[PDB]
Structure 1
């Protein structure tokens, strides 16, 4: 499966508000046009498979709505403006139009076309630019600019026509999609996550069940997660902390078979409804962080978003990530604000009785295989020295250290670094080396010599490496099997059956927050002398979210499986699911909490509880 589907039609922009109603004046047809033209101006729309729109059938509509409400809406095309206004007064924050029933059927049908495209392996993922939005509509009521619930349609449709048992819905719109929650509150097969402006119930829709204490009812208890922002102005740090410490661990433990996104961009800076301070680029990462789920099968559906400029920018960021283009570096990240930390600690505590991870106590890639080893590399890869490179190698040899093979590996390292950093030609790479010491020294020092302010080293093995963590230029993440006794603040040391769950927990809760706050210019991966076979691909894919994806992996020893997985993850292929994760060993959880308490003073992004005032 390859490619991304873009589903859009100008007909969904042919309905508008016909009377004066300041509540709805923001929901304009231009939202679609500005969006699509955005993807057109940046050349993104041309790279997507343009799947056409269809109407949703009556049975498909009845999957999520009542026949009475369907018959009521079905009659709006026959009403004049006075009758339409009277009909709109019967619901909250909603207007109807002569074409709105048609357009809502088109929006639902576009969502279903996207679901069919993704599940039939015709495309890897995709986005649907639809209108009206859906996540506020309920079984027998239009609500909040929404007529029919597109995402609930998608989930129920996937369940019915593909026998899916686990679906994840991520609603990053700034409003609480109460329609989806109502639809799946007793359903443990569809996990609904939603962050939303709440302000202690004073923000629309002013529902007590939008609060963190609504975990779902009945058999679906623990499969409805609400994260209420109780203050405006939430930044990139708040969003990323919500992902790292709430959504992503639950998601990877859940192991969904399909991910559907209520992509509402009224949660971005500039929007008059959300009033948050998140830059559009954050949506490149919110997308990217979810790609390893469901083997990449992601369905992005448009919801809110009303600042035309920031809306176009955020849509472009999302599509950029869906196509696999390098995610942009996010700087200035730090601790979440106190209100966000309160919301996060509350939702974690209440959900801990369902997810034990929350309990507390009081050419894209290049490949340098061993000489003579001919490999079958994917279409986004290529193989490998010059006079300048050989001169630099001779210089470092006569200055700091006669194998000829190690010299070849060093020249290849210098060449791939030059191609990654001093050019847009190559993004990331992988080299099989012999001597780990000399290879790592050359790699790190030459990366620092190139315009690389900071470097994030990720070493899997034991013993000490030749890398100094004194100055604020290098951060080391060591995955070992021996004692830690960590002392430096620029290092994260980590020490067989429960190893997969523990490693994923450590990656989502400790590695990614520190690494995102660090904002490196180059990630340098090392693997000594094979439990890593279970997790290494996920780590590579998730760590590519930094340094614009520029990652140089050094592998000490040939392993066809490990090399294949490394290059596949680096080149952007789909990651295979880990299977439903379980519980890590309690000693490992205690060790992770100790590392967090050790590092969270310097690295605020590690916090998931409001700090204690001395």
Structure 2
């Protein structure tokens, strides 16, 4: 399986610029590329990526997305003086030309194709191309919005042609609408395009009626274009995450793409003068992380915009950090999306309910500027520690390790004297294991998480939970797959309990989420709907300092456990301890793999979830979203 992250960059692409005064074009400057690469070097991230050389896109490759007439016209700009370059630029909207931009445009496109080849050939797991000029406004026969050729559109067409891919997801988190990409694929059901964008009721550039939520695609492509317009500026981390949990992710995981391309413009970040949004650079670590379980991790990030040189550097680093597998930063202060965003989200979910299973229930009434510098993200020396049953060695990834100090055995003895009587000296070894593993996870930046096999559940959970609380980790999220009651107190806002079980138990209060799904062929899609629509929104708002996972010995969800384990590491900087009750070699090996940062096998498209399950899940949302507003995907009723 593949490893490493490509970083594709060439300082040649910084060698064109604006040659006349035009305050509207003043902001697209060569220093965007230098500052972004220099910031990756400063943080040691460029050095950890495989540098892959830039190349020129060939004429045949340019013609996958552009017309001969347009290519021939752009091919003449190297020979133009400034006057002729000005006259040529003015035939297009918000774009300037330079003697070297044709050269650089061919490099930006070839760079993008280099990234596609490295990922699809399994030479790297994923990667990023830092390119200029950007691509996503570019169209078959026109330059537009600083774009000459459509870098991302190239990549999807090239990947279709040369790797025979049937499903490609393009995520455009730039702050502008990538209409070039929408036009290119509006009739193609094999490319799914998602874009959020500053819109302001069509008053924001490019001022297009078809950037609205009602553009779903055309003909065979209906439902494979998703526009989420932002109708006010100042959108926050909560707005972006609500967009992911309630629009993009439910559709992406159902589409099940074979490759993910990101149109990664960072003008959607705080401080940018074009976007005027308020999302912190750290949010891009999570936008990246949330998409990485797709397509076995095959993800091509390509730079588009971003004009605040400071927030540009930081959001590029957060992105590459996440591509490299580094632990994600904690996101605090999450809440409801604002009313404007909830309206946009509700509107796109409704118009898309004809085409996607996660929105289907909406169709029938029977069912319906300065900001703090980001903290450091040092990867753990050994990411994952594992404690199998005694004397069971197993092939572990190069960054895992097996596990009892004298200090620890004293604590275990102390705890048993006071709270347990018990003398099964094996489940006493379990307690030294749990405590040894927990103390490495928290006291050390050298271990990130771990998994422990245990015999007796109740004493296991108590010591894990209590040792973590009294450590102190302010908040602990507990995710329990099994039935019955555990020694867990949802008494205060220090513990939130997610429980996935098989008996429908009434839910008391807003610090427990109990999911009882009907067992059958639909159990897998239901679990994914709950994960993306219920569990992740609450968990992100809760913001735990540790995640405690618990599986009782009984199989039925061996297919989704790796997706949950990967996604749940967006919380608590990845600090998760999993307790597996009883040895199960497959579940144990699956758990360690996802904890260790490995790629997760695709789910494939699965059987649509049972309506009874969706009913259960929306009753949970109704019950919890007044407390946990990141669960909202409709505007609330005013009094």
TM-score by length of 1: 1.00
Deviation at 1:535, TM superposition (A): 0.2
Query: Would the aligned equivalents of 1:76 and 1:84 in 2 still touch at CA under 8 Å?
Result: yes
Decide whether the 8 Å contact of 2:522 with 2:606 is kept in 1. no
Shift in Å at residue 360 of structure 1? 4.1
Q: Is the 8 A contact 1:365 1:429 kept in 2?
A: yes
Give, in angstroms, the shift of residue 5 of structure 1: 0.1
Q: Which residue of 1 aligns with 2:372?
A: none
- Conserved? CA contact 2:353–2:362, under 8 Å: no
Q: 1:345 to 1:411 in 2, by over 3 A?
A: same
Is residue 490 of structure 1 aligned with residue 511 of structure 2? yes
CA RMSD of aligned residues (A): 0.7
SS in 2 for 1:267: coil
| 1:356, distance to aligned residue in structure 2 (A) | 2.7
Q: Answer yes or no: is the 8 Å Cα contact 1:457–1:474 preserved in 2.
A: yes
Whole-angstrom CA distance in 2 between matches of 1:464 and 1:414? 22
Aligned-residue offset at 1:287: 0.1
Deviations 1:158-190 (A, max 9, x none): 000000000000000000000000000000000
Distance, in Å, in 2 between the alignment partners of 1:553 and 1:468 is 19
How far apart in 1 are the matches of 2:472 and 2:303? Answer: 39
Contact 2:521–2:607 (Cα < 8 Å) also in 1: no
Tell me, yes or no, if the aligned pair for 2:361 and 2:614 is still in contact at 8 Å.
Answer: no
Give the match's secondary structure for 2:559: helix
Separation in 1, partners of 2:47, 2:472:
33
Following TM superposition, by how much is the alpha carbon of 1:280 offset from its aligned partner in structure 2, in angstroms?
0.3
Distance 1:361 1:222 in 2: 15
Contact 1:253 1:582 in 2 (8 A): no
Distance 2:266 2:606 in 1: 31
Deviation at 1:359, TM superposition (A): 3.2
Q: Deviations over 1:467-506 (max 9, x none)?
A: 0001110000000000121012100001111000000000
| Structure 1 segments (4+ residues) deviating >3 Å | 359-362
Contact 1:289 1:542 survives alignment (8 Å): yes
Seen in structure 2, the aligned counterparts of structure 1 residues 519 and 141 have a Cα distance that, compared at 3 Å, is same
8 Å Cα contact 1:188-1:219 kept in structure 2 = yes
Q: Which residue of 1 aligns with 2:383?
A: 364
1:540 is aligned to: 565
CA distance in 2, matches of 1:248, 1:531: 23
2:161 is paired with a residue whose SS is helix
Quote the Cα distance in structure 2 between the aligned partners of 1:60 and 1:426.
46
1:602 deviates by: 0.1
* Structure 1 CA distance for aligned equivalents of residues 161 and 399 of structure 2: 36
- Three-state SS of the structure 1 residue aligned to 2:280 is coil
TM-score, with length taken from structure 2: 0.96
Q: CA deviation at 1:582?
A: 3.8
Deviations 1:539-566 (A, max 9, x none): 0000000000000000001011000000
Aligned: 1:479 with 2:516: no
Cα drift, residue 451 of structure 1: 2.5
Deviates more, 1:421-430 or 1:362-371: 362-371
CA drift of 1:357 comes to 1.5
1:413-466 deviations in whole A, cap 9, x for unaligned? Answer: 101111001110100000000000000000000001112000000000000000
Show CA shifts across 1:241-283 (max 9, x none).
0000000000000000000000000000000000000000000
Q: Is the 8 A contact 1:390 1:411 kept in 2?
A: yes
Report if the CA contact (8 A) 2:265-2:306 is conserved. Answer: yes
Deviation at 1:532, TM superposition (A): 2.0
Cα distance between partner residues in 2 of 1:425 and 1:233 = 38
1:581 Cα shift? 2.9
* SS of residue matched to 1:494: strand
The equivalent residue for 2:411 is 392
Q: Give the aligned partner of residue 48 of structure 2.
A: 47
* Equivalent residue for 1:449, pick from 470, 486, 495: 470
Paired residue total: 614
Contact map agreement 2:350 2:362 (CA 8 A) in 1: no
Cα deviation digits, residues 13-59 of structure 1 (max 9, x gap): 00000000111100000000000000000000000000000000000
* Structure 2 residue matching 1:318: 3-state secondary structure: helix
Shift of 1:591: 0.3
Distance in 1 (CA, whole Å) between partners of 2:530 and 2:121 is 34
Q: Which segments of 5 or more consecutive residues in structure 1 lack a partner in the other structure?
A: none
Deviation per CA, 1:320-372: give whole Å up to 9, x if none: 00000000000000000000000000000000000132134590000000001
**Contact 2:115–2:127 (Cα < 8 Å) also in 1:** yes
CA distance in 1, matches of 2:156, 2:101: 23
Q: Which residue of 1 aligns with 2:28?
A: 27
Aligned to 1:364, what secondary structure does the other structure show? strand
Name the CA distance, whole Å, in 1 between partners of 2:476 and 2:112: 42
Deviation of residue 587 (structure 1)? 0.2
Measure, in 1, the Cα distance between the counterparts of 2:349 and 2:569: 27
Q: Secondary structure at the match of 1:131?
A: coil
C-alpha separation in 1, matches of 2:360 and 2:294: 24
Distance 1:203 1:361 in 2: 30
Deviates more, 1:2-11 or 1:401-410: 401-410
* Residues 168-567 of structure 1 aligned to structure 2 (within 5 Å): 168-360=169-361, 363-401=382-420, 402-495=423-516, 496-529=520-553, 530-567=555-592
Partner SS for 1:415: helix
Decide whether the 8 Å contact of 1:242 with 1:344 is kept in 2. Answer: yes
Classify the secondary structure of the residue corresponding to 1:5: strand
Inter-partner Cα distance in structure 1 for 2:34 and 2:489:
52
Structure 1 contact 32–130 (Cα < 8 Å) conserved: yes
Following the alignment from structure 1 to structure 2, what is the Cα–Cα distance between the partners of residues 51 and 400?
58
Alpha-carbon contact 1:252-1:581 (below 8 Å) kept: no
CA deviation map 1:105-129 (0-9, x unaligned): 0000000000000000000000000
Structure 2 unaligned regions, length at least 5: 364-381
CA contact (8 A) 2:77 2:102 kept: yes
> What CA deviation, in whole Å up to 9, does each residue of 1:303-325 have, x standing for no partner?
00000000000000000000000
Q: Check whether the contact 1:254–1:581 (CA below 8 A) recurs between aligned residues.
A: no
